[PDB]
Amino acid sequence: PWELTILHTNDVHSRLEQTSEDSSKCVDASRCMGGVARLFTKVQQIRRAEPNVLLLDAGDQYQGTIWFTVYKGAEVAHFMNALRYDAMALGNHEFDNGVEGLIEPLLKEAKFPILSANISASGPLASQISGLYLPYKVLPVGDEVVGIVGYTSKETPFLSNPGTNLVFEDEITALQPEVDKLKTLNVNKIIALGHSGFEMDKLIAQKVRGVDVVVGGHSNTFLYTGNPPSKEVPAGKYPFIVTSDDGRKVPVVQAYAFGKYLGYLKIEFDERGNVISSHGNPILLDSSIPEDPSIKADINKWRIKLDDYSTQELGKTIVYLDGSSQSCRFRECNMGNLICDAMINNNLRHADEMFWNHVSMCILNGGGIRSPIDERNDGTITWENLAAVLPFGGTFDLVQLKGSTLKKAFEHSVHRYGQSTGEFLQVGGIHVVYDLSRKPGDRVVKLDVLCTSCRVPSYDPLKMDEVYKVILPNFLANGGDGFQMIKDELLRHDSGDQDINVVSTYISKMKVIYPAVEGRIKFS
């Protein structure tokens, strides 16, 4: 048998430096984890021991920290080149700075192939990008070859800024003919590497005939065989075994997010490229693995421009930005309005004749707003100032919620009103009226929401059966501050942009801000 070791990352999301256990800023070095210097050590160790190794990334290196804000993907090309990745699939966040922000920093500077079989271009863009990403690439491994066919979420136009030329085809439709082609070219070992989420990964494993293993991403899925090594709870075994339509067992893998784990799968193939066995587990990149000193020193050199950027003026406020808990845990606060307005502006995507924009609504728990910003420093706002307001390194995510779920969330928001608890909601595109004299669970007396399927945005009563798109912190999507109904009842959840970055981009676009308290939240 011929044994291949697949090492894989996904959804690293700009975690160049080691992180805390919950993938926020590293504070206690002895408990820190991940980062590219530590990954380098582990990858180098495995490549010394195993003959046939591929190191693969399933997309979403872009977006997540000040690294991406400042270096705009140059850090991804540089550090992925240093680790000697063998291939990468395009993720949705690779389009966050448009097609231009993908071509210049990453496609032109990567020393490895970048893959997606289900993205097509037309007009001048087609000529401009031809060959800079590929549907697949056949790689030599020892005296053998392995084909690697890429794919990217069909939902990318709703989840990033790819622009109106690129077309994202159904993944299975696009993949099958490429896998068929590889079989005709005597490539009998085929990895599907791509960025659509665990559910689609299982469908690809089932339906794309000739795929031997699926290496996925997007959904931040943690899979594990045995006792988990940290706080992440497995969604299933590693690998997850799909029974294909052709009758074969097909392993599906993912490795969480944020560079906390290195995926590790060993596959035995027969002479005809059939999988005989597969086994492995993600490896927790904890402090027992030393950071490579060379990579760490290069990281520290690149950090100088981040420190410089962090104290520069992003824009100005002419108003006090009231992020005090005495305001934002009790009533509408203008810092809450600012952040929700920034969230909505970040999620302006291309729209049909069917909607002015696909999403119009925002909620933000007051517990997540951690400081005010004073306007009397000549109005200046810096990244450092925003990091005091939003210190946890989270994202502002897109979810789909029934109106009934959103009504329960607003009842939760005031169920124990008066105690300065975190669950009180700041809003955008929502007007709520509470009557605190009513019983807990029955205090919401008016709830109106901004239409999407309308040419003129206006407010309509929330309907209980309708499904609404909402932008909210990942903390709330995961049931934080007691919002278990959001976690348990949401229909769809896709990870968004970094919290500080969303607000910084809005302030830099606006140049001078003046958010008011305007009646989004009222009391009877």
Q: Which residues are annotated as a binding site for IMP?
A: 329, 365, 370, 392, 475, 481
Element (H, E) at 49: helix 36-49
Task: Output the smallest distance, CB 8 to Ca ion, in A.
Answer: 18
Residue 375 lies near its own copies (rule: CB under 8 A)? yes
* Residue from the set 147, 263, 273, 480 that interacts with Ca ion by CB under 5 A: 273
Read off the tokens for 72.
């705009």
**What x/- string results for residues 276 through 315 when contact with ligand 4NC is judged by CB under 6 A?**
---------------------------x--xx--x-----
Q: Which of 41/345 has CB closer to its own copies?
A: 345
| Binding status of residue 353 toward its own copies by CB under 8 A | yes
Applying CB under 8 A, does 516 fall inside the site for its own copies? Answer: yes
How much of the chain is in helix, strand and coil states, percent to nearest 5?
Answer: 30, 25, 45
SS3 of residue 256 by DSSP? coil
Q: Which of 396, 475, 483, 506 binds ligand 4NC (CB under 6 A)?
A: 475
Q: Could you give the CA distance from residue 18 to residue 33 in angstroms, rounded to a whole number?
A: 5
Place of tokens 């430096």: 17
Distance CA 447, CA 462 (A): 6
Q: Which residues bind Zn ion (CB under 5 A)?
A: 11, 60, 91-92, 218, 495
Q: What backbone phi and psi angles, to 5 degrees, belong to 133?
A: -130, 155
Residue 272 makes contact with its own copies by CB under 8 A:
no
392 binds ligand 4NC (CB under 6 A): yes
What is the C-alpha to C-alpha distance for residues 173 and 254, in angstroms, rounded to an integer?
Answer: 22
The residue behind tokens 């808990």 is: 325
Cβ 420 to ligand 4NC shortest distance, Å: 10
Cis before 239 (ω within 30): yes
Q: Which is nearer to its own copies, 356 or 392 (CB)?
A: 356
Nearer to its own copies, 141 or 319 (CB): 319
Toward Ca ion, which CB reaches closer, 241 or 445? Answer: 241
Cβ nearer to ligand 4NC, comparing 153 with 385: 385
Q: What are phi and psi of 228, to 5 degrees?
A: -65, 145
84 contributes a contact to its own copies by CB under 8 A: no
- Please name the residues in contact with 499: beta carbons below 8 A apart, sequence gap of 6 or more: 390, 392, 393, 394, 395, 396, 473
Shortest reach from residue 311's CB to Ca ion, in Å:
54
Q: Among residues 210 and 515, whose Cβ is nearest to Ca ion? A: 210
Q: Report the alpha-carbon distance of residue 414 to residue 143 in Å, rounded.
A: 66
Instruction: Rule CB under 6 A: say whether 330 interacts with ligand 4NC.
Output: no
Decide if 401 contacts 470 (C-beta within 8 A).
yes
Please give the structure tokens belonging to residue 336: 């809450």
> What is the closest distance, in whole angstroms, from the C-beta atom of residue 16 to ligand 4NC in the complex?
8
Q: Which residues, 6 or more positions from 94, have their beta carbon under 8 angstroms from its beta carbon?
A: 59, 60, 61, 62, 102, 106, 160
Q: Does 481 bind ligand 4NC (CB under 6 A)?
A: yes
Who's near 104: CB < 8 A, 6+ residues apart? none
Out of 17, 96, 201, 322, name the contact with its own copies by CB under 8 A: 322
Q: Are 140 and 181 in contact (CB under 8 A)?
A: no
Q: How far is the CB of 511 from ligand 4NC (least distance, A)?
A: 22
Comparing CB distances to Ca ion, the nearer of 76 and 179 is 179
The Cα–Cα gap between 129 and 331 comes to: 50
Q: From residue 476 to residue 515, what is the string marking binding to its own copies with x (rule CB under 8 A)?
A: ---------------------------------x-xx-xx
Q: How far from chain centre, in Å, is Cα 451?
A: 26
Annotated binding residues for Zn(2+)? 11, 13, 60, 92, 195, 218
Cα 34 to chain center, whole Å? 17
Q: State the minimum distance, in angstroms, from the CB of residue 128 to its own copies.
A: 21
Planar angle of CA 193, 196, 199, nearest 5 degrees: 105
What would the x/- binding string for its own copies be over residues 415 to 454, using CB under 8 A?
A: ----------------x------------------x----
CB 306 within 8 A of CB 70: yes
Contact (CB, 8 A) for 280 and 239:
yes
Answer positive or negative: Cα dihedral of 219, 224, 228, 229. Answer: negative
Segment near its own copies (CB under 8 A); pick from 22-30, 200-208, 316-324, 437-445 = 316-324
Binding mask 45-74 for ligand 4NC (x = CB under 6 A): ---------------------x--------
If one asks whether residue 456 binds its own copies (CB under 8 A), the answer comes out as yes
Known binding positions for AMP: 329, 365, 370, 392, 475, 481
Q: What does 306 bind: Ca ion, its own copies, ligand 4NC, none (CB cut-off 5 to 8 Å by kind)?
A: ligand 4NC
For Ca ion, the closer CB: 127 or 186: 186
> Which residues contact residue 143 at a Cβ distance below 8 angstroms, ignoring those fewer than 6 apart?
none
Contact 119, 166 (CB under 8 A): yes
Identify which of 220, 8, 37, 14 has the alpha carbon closest to the alpha carbon of residue 105: 14
Q: Is 22 in the site for ligand 4NC (CB under 6 A)?
A: no
Q: What angle do CA 294, 298, 300 make, to 5 degrees?
A: 115
- Interface ranges with its own copies (CB under 8 A): 318-320, 322, 334, 348, 351, 353, 356-357, 375-376, 431, 450, 455-459, 509, 511-512, 514-519
- Interface ranges with Ca ion (CB under 5 A): 188, 212, 273
- Interface ranges with ligand 4NC (CB under 6 A): 17, 66, 303, 306-307, 310, 365, 367-368, 383, 387, 392, 422, 475, 480-481
